[PDB]
Write a protein that holds these residues in place. Structure first.
Motif, PDB file in Angstrom:
ATOM      1  N   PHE A 154      42.643  95.297  -6.098  1.00 38.97           N
ATOM      2  CA  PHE A 154      42.751  95.945  -4.794  1.00 38.97           C
ATOM      3  C   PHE A 154      42.383  94.976  -3.677  1.00 38.97           C
ATOM      4  CE2 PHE A 154      41.596  99.363  -7.843  1.00 38.97           C
ATOM      5  CZ  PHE A 154      42.762 100.114  -7.773  1.00 38.97           C
ATOM      6  N   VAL A 155      43.325  94.760  -2.764  1.00 36.96           N
ATOM      7  CA  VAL A 155      43.111  93.860  -1.634  1.00 36.96           C
ATOM      8  C   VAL A 155      42.355  94.561  -0.509  1.00 36.96           C
ATOM      9  CG1 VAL A 155      45.048  92.309  -2.105  1.00 36.96           C
ATOM     10  CG2 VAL A 155      45.428  94.350  -0.713  1.00 36.96           C
TER      11      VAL A 155
ATOM     12  N   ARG B 234      41.363  95.502   3.446  1.00 39.48           N
ATOM     13  CA  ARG B 234      42.166  95.955   4.582  1.00 39.48           C
ATOM     14  C   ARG B 234      42.553  94.819   5.537  1.00 39.48           C
ATOM     15  NH1 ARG B 234      38.210 101.027   5.164  1.00 39.48           N
ATOM     16  NH2 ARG B 234      37.196  99.723   3.570  1.00 39.48           N
ATOM     17  N   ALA B 235      41.749  93.757   5.553  1.00 40.62           N
ATOM     18  CA  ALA B 235      42.024  92.570   6.361  1.00 40.62           C
ATOM     19  C   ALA B 235      43.205  91.761   5.817  1.00 40.62           C
ATOM     20  CB  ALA B 235      40.783  91.700   6.458  1.00 40.62           C
TER      21      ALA B 235
ATOM     22  N   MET C 242      45.714  93.081   4.053  1.00 38.38           N
ATOM     23  CA  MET C 242      46.888  93.915   4.326  1.00 38.38           C
ATOM     24  C   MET C 242      47.363  93.812   5.777  1.00 38.38           C
ATOM     25  SD  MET C 242      46.320  97.292   1.913  1.00 38.38           S
ATOM     26  CE  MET C 242      44.855  97.940   2.717  1.00 38.38           C
TER      27      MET C 242
ATOM     28  N   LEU D 166      44.817  76.445   7.514  1.00 33.80           N
ATOM     29  CA  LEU D 166      43.641  77.232   7.145  1.00 33.80           C
ATOM     30  C   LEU D 166      43.715  77.690   5.689  1.00 33.80           C
ATOM     31  CD1 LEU D 166      43.002  79.436  10.340  1.00 33.80           C
ATOM     32  CD2 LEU D 166      41.323  77.881   9.325  1.00 33.80           C
TER      33      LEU D 166
ATOM     34  N   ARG E 288      41.142  75.876   2.913  1.00 31.50           N
ATOM     35  CA  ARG E 288      40.231  76.808   2.246  1.00 31.50           C
ATOM     36  C   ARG E 288      40.409  76.765   0.729  1.00 31.50           C
ATOM     37  NH1 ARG E 288      40.573  82.187   6.244  1.00 31.50           N
ATOM     38  NH2 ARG E 288      39.439  81.248   7.999  1.00 31.50           N
TER      39      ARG E 288
ATOM     40  N   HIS F  77      47.097  87.026  -6.352  1.00 33.54           N
ATOM     41  CA  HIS F  77      46.900  88.480  -6.386  1.00 33.54           C
ATOM     42  C   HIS F  77      46.124  89.049  -7.580  1.00 33.54           C
ATOM     43  CE1 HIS F  77      50.943  87.675  -8.152  1.00 33.54           C
ATOM     44  NE2 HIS F  77      50.524  88.536  -9.061  1.00 33.54           N
TER      45      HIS F  77
ATOM     46  N   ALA G 255      49.230  83.874   5.748  1.00 38.67           N
ATOM     47  CA  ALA G 255      48.107  84.348   6.559  1.00 38.67           C
ATOM     48  C   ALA G 255      47.119  85.147   5.719  1.00 38.67           C
ATOM     49  CB  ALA G 255      48.608  85.183   7.729  1.00 38.67           C
TER      50      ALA G 255
ATOM     51  N   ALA H 102      45.163  82.927   3.290  1.00 37.73           N
ATOM     52  CA  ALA H 102      44.026  82.337   4.005  1.00 37.73           C
ATOM     53  C   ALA H 102      42.843  83.303   4.095  1.00 37.73           C
ATOM     54  CB  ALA H 102      44.446  81.879   5.398  1.00 37.73           C
ATOM     55  N   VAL H 103      43.128  84.555   4.452  1.00 41.45           N
ATOM     56  CA  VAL H 103      42.114  85.613   4.517  1.00 41.45           C
ATOM     57  C   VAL H 103      41.464  85.820   3.150  1.00 41.45           C
ATOM     58  CG1 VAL H 103      41.643  88.048   5.074  1.00 41.45           C
ATOM     59  CG2 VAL H 103      43.324  86.771   6.409  1.00 41.45           C
TER      60      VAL H 103
ATOM     61  N   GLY I 148      39.295  82.883   2.329  1.00 46.50           N
ATOM     62  CA  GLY I 148      38.097  83.017   3.156  1.00 46.50           C
ATOM     63  C   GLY I 148      37.087  83.968   2.541  1.00 46.50           C
ATOM     64  N   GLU I 149      37.580  85.109   2.062  1.00 46.52           N
ATOM     65  CA  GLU I 149      36.755  86.103   1.376  1.00 46.52           C
ATOM     66  C   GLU I 149      36.203  85.573   0.051  1.00 46.52           C
ATOM     67  OE1 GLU I 149      39.013  89.753   1.007  1.00 46.52           O
ATOM     68  OE2 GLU I 149      39.411  89.831   3.159  1.00 46.52           O
TER      69      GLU I 149
ATOM     70  N   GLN J 223      32.993  83.270   0.403  1.00 44.89           N
ATOM     71  CA  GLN J 223      31.748  83.986   0.701  1.00 44.89           C
ATOM     72  C   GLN J 223      30.943  84.253  -0.573  1.00 44.89           C
ATOM     73  OE1 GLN J 223      32.788  85.400   5.023  1.00 44.89           O
ATOM     74  NE2 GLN J 223      30.961  84.670   3.931  1.00 44.89           N
TER      75      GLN J 223
ATOM     76  N   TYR K 180      40.220  95.521  10.922  1.00 46.92           N
ATOM     77  CA  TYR K 180      39.387  94.874   9.907  1.00 46.92           C
ATOM     78  C   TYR K 180      39.522  93.351   9.873  1.00 46.92           C
ATOM     79  CZ  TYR K 180      38.393  99.568   8.098  1.00 46.92           C
ATOM     80  OH  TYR K 180      37.983 100.875   7.960  1.00 46.92           O
ATOM     81  N   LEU K 181      40.676  92.840  10.301  1.00 42.04           N
ATOM     82  CA  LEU K 181      40.929  91.395  10.325  1.00 42.04           C
ATOM     83  C   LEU K 181      40.130  90.620  11.392  1.00 42.04           C
ATOM     84  CD1 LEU K 181      42.378  88.970   9.045  1.00 42.04           C
ATOM     85  CD2 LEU K 181      44.433  89.565  10.329  1.00 42.04           C
TER      86      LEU K 181
ATOM     87  N   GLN L 112      36.627  90.311   9.894  1.00 37.61           N
ATOM     88  CA  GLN L 112      36.629  89.534   8.653  1.00 37.61           C
ATOM     89  C   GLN L 112      36.953  88.055   8.871  1.00 37.61           C
ATOM     90  OE1 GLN L 112      36.828  91.239   4.742  1.00 37.61           O
ATOM     91  NE2 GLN L 112      35.347  89.635   5.276  1.00 37.61           N
ATOM     92  N   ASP L 113      38.025  87.782   9.612  1.00 34.48           N
ATOM     93  CA  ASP L 113      38.530  86.420   9.767  1.00 34.48           C
ATOM     94  C   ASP L 113      38.947  86.116  11.212  1.00 34.48           C
ATOM     95  OD1 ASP L 113      39.700  83.817   9.134  1.00 34.48           O
ATOM     96  OD2 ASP L 113      39.955  84.570   7.087  1.00 34.48           O
TER      97      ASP L 113
ATOM     98  N   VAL M 216      41.828  83.240  11.561  1.00 35.19           N
ATOM     99  CA  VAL M 216      43.183  83.686  11.225  1.00 35.19           C
ATOM    100  C   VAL M 216      43.709  84.691  12.255  1.00 35.19           C
ATOM    101  CG1 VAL M 216      44.610  84.916   9.509  1.00 35.19           C
ATOM    102  CG2 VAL M 216      42.986  83.173   8.752  1.00 35.19           C
TER     103      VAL M 216
ATOM    104  N   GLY N 101      52.330  95.943   5.280  1.00 36.96           N
ATOM    105  CA  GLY N 101      50.871  95.971   5.257  1.00 36.96           C
ATOM    106  C   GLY N 101      50.308  97.181   4.532  1.00 36.96           C
TER     107      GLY N 101
ATOM    108  N   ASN O 239      49.351  95.911  -4.338  1.00 39.05           N
ATOM    109  CA  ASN O 239      48.441  96.036  -5.481  1.00 39.05           C
ATOM    110  C   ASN O 239      49.144  96.284  -6.814  1.00 39.05           C
ATOM    111  OD1 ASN O 239      46.076  97.817  -3.371  1.00 39.05           O
ATOM    112  ND2 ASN O 239      46.179  95.617  -3.826  1.00 39.05           N
TER     113      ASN O 239
END
Lengths: 405, 405
Positions: A34-35, A37-38, A40, A73, A77, A225, A264, A267-268, A271-272, A275, B3-4, B7-8, B11, B44, B49
């Motif tokens: 599950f991705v 919300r950022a 998506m 980016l 990353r 994914h 894009a 990259a997000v 980035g996640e 962390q 949320y983006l 979060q980032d 980006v 989006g 998933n």
């Protein structure tokens, strides 16, 4: 959503059904996750409007000033995440990521050594109905019939006999840690390139729970994914000596315009992954997989390799005299999503199988822990040991519903 | 977005810059367009998933009940839109759509006849640095040196000499209507399949302003993101006799898991295309292209083919003694986005060129009409006839800003 419900009621209704389905069911498909919300929101951005053929700075179109930043980016990353000298974040899929590497180092009809498809190997690792097996001469190495761990002497013997130009490592259904040091050692003996398709284990490599293939392989391919928990796409990692060749293979080689909105989101996702929480997440995935494996054995199930070292496990269903197809069907009835999977040395065809593949990456993202793993395995026991009983499947149906709120 | 931004920030800032760029600049890249907010929301969605390897109903994974509906909606709308007997909405790109058709009907080293790349043909129609020219033996047909219209006697002569297994029709930079009836007539003489890559003209075909290749071609490939005004991806149309083979070529042939969120957006895009407003839109695109072509000639520019019949035009910059590279650079300075493009029989390399490619599909989506076309052409005249004057480029810069609110 705001504009889609008004514009397209049919498409919106099916998406909402899928949205509610993902919440209601217990998703145990090892390749699924599950991705955020950022991620998506990045995929649902205006970046789909832009043709960015080429690479950051070296584009074949103007107005790419900002999508260049996005791709850079994503690339930087990924290099920071895996310790790679070069990254290519343009592959539309893992299949195209593999395809580009094959396009780089191989001529048509070249011998390539990959993992046996019925032993854990992927479709793009030499299936006769896939481009890889048709375009290139694929030979297979296998696992030990008892331990189901890769027979590295067999990898060495097949390499010394068939003399491949390329050796591919990694799998779609291999529950153990892959020794990349031995794969490079074998490749250096026969003078072959080593490619590692880390698609499944990518997120575990990023968290440092599976050995990094990067220092050992000439090419590392992956999907974004799976355990990496990003958007649906591919990525290629390599050293700087192949960097130019790998880029040429993606464009103008096998692809055209990249998906800048997906890049894009990559990259997000990267980035996640950088962390600290993601490292804690990925360890829980591994912890949950070990707990689920141990709990299924407690229920009386035989597992391929006798457990797991990663995110996934394979249930040998032969003692229960059940096929993977039957198990997949009956678990779907109670709200548990698995997929039928060939076990090493399967007496059944790939369309029937003797096993089911189970992963923990998806349920761990939800918040599932060791306690929930015990319950999931208990439900599987109730279902598969009582396939003919509708009262047991109703009991299972309610227990699945209790786990998903 | 919500949320983006949290979060980032890096980006999100680049996306916001790109969002503002698309609004500020005059986008005249013929392959580009602006998607509706409903299309973006579908991209989006949580559909990223889901692994849906296979096809609606005939999946290799469970839980596909609702994504099947989505794909069927995409396939049936496309069949309704183009009058095709079968559709495949899984290609990740136009490149992969072409690749799958080549994978279907051709062996390695087979002779294929496509359009000359410097005369308008696409990279996937036989570039020696692209998979098509390396995998298959590509021969080229051309256009008349004076009229720049496809020489159909040359198509016939090249086919009768080289005896291709497949003939490819359509282009990336051809401003005239393609006679698909003649292409099939030539193909039937030499006993070859006819493939039409309608990627650029797809939306005009859907509105009935360009002849439909479907009744004439064995295979029709396209992108969804050009004049069709959909998400970034590909599609294959064919008759039912090839339906099974085309599906096998996509999966398990050249791809793996499809992009269900993008397929959702394809369905939305096809739904929007079926509506009456899209037909009115696509006619304005054609009307705007004719007006812009006529207005540039009024400014003193020479056009390839002496105008246009579709959405795009090519400016022959040789009378102004300018390269496409120079024109592309100076127009970028004033806020007009074009791309350098080889003209038929170009004395310059594909990296310098003697022309620029201009399309109206993007500006027409914004609301630009015949009046705005006159102004755009006037600005281009001011810029290219006064390349050394910074006062003219400042005047142009302000006039571009006035058009974009």
């Amino acid at each position: 959503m705001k504009y889609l419900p008004q514009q397209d009621p049919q498409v919106f209704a099916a998406i909402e059904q899928e949205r509610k389905r993902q919440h209601a069911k217990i998703e145990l498909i090892a390749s699924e996750n599950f991705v955020s919300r950022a991620v998506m929101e990045a995929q649902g951005s205006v970046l789909t409007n832009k043709y960015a053929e080429g690479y950051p700075g070296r584009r074949y179109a103007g107005g790419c000033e900002y999508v260049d930043i996005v791709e850079e980016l994503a690339r930087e990353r990924a290099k920071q995440l895996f310790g790679a000298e070069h990254a290519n974040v343009q592959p539309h899929s893992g299949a195209q990521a593999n395809m580009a590497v094959y396009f780089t180092v191989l001529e048509h009809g070249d011998t390539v050594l990959g993992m046996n498809l019925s032993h854990g190997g992927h479709l793009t690792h030499g299936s006769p109905v896939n481009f890889s097996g048709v375009q290139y001469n694929f030979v297979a190495y296998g696992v030990d019939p008892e331990t189901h761990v890769i027979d590295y002497d067999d990898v060495r013997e097949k390499a010394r006999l068939h003399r491949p130009k390329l050796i591919v490592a990694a799998a779609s259904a291999y529950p153990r840690i892959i020794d990349f040091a031995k794969f490079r050692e074998i490749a250096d003996e026969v003078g072959a390139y080593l490619m590692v398709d880390m698609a499944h284990i990518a997120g575990l490599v990023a968290a440092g729970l599976h050995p990094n293939p990067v220092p050992y392989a000439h090419f590392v391919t992956t999907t974004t994914h799976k355990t990496l928990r990003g958007p649906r796409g591919g990525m290629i990692l390599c050293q700087e000596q192949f960097a130019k060749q790998i880029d040429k293979a993606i464009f103008p080689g096998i692809q055209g315009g990249p998906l800048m909105h997906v890049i894009a989101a990559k990259a997000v996702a990267f980035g996640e992954a950088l962390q600290d929480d993601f490292k804690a997440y990925a360890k829980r995935v591994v912890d949950n997989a070990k707990r689920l494996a141990s709990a299924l054995q407690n229920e009386g199930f035989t597992l391929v390799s006798g457990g797991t070292d990663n995110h996934l496990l394979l249930v040998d269903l032969r003692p229960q005299q059940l096929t993977g197809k039957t198990a997949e069907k009956v678990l779907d009835e109670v709200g548990i999503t698995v997929n039928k999977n060939t076990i090493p040395y399967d007496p059944e065809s790939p369309f029937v199988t003797s096993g089911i593949r189970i992963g923990t990456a998806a349920v761990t993202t939800r918040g599932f822990g060791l306690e929930e793993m015990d319950e999931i395995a208990a439900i599987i026991g109730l279902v598969l040991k009582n396939v003919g009983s509708e009262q047991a499947l109703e009991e299972a149906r309610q227990r699945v519903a209790a786990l998903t709120d």
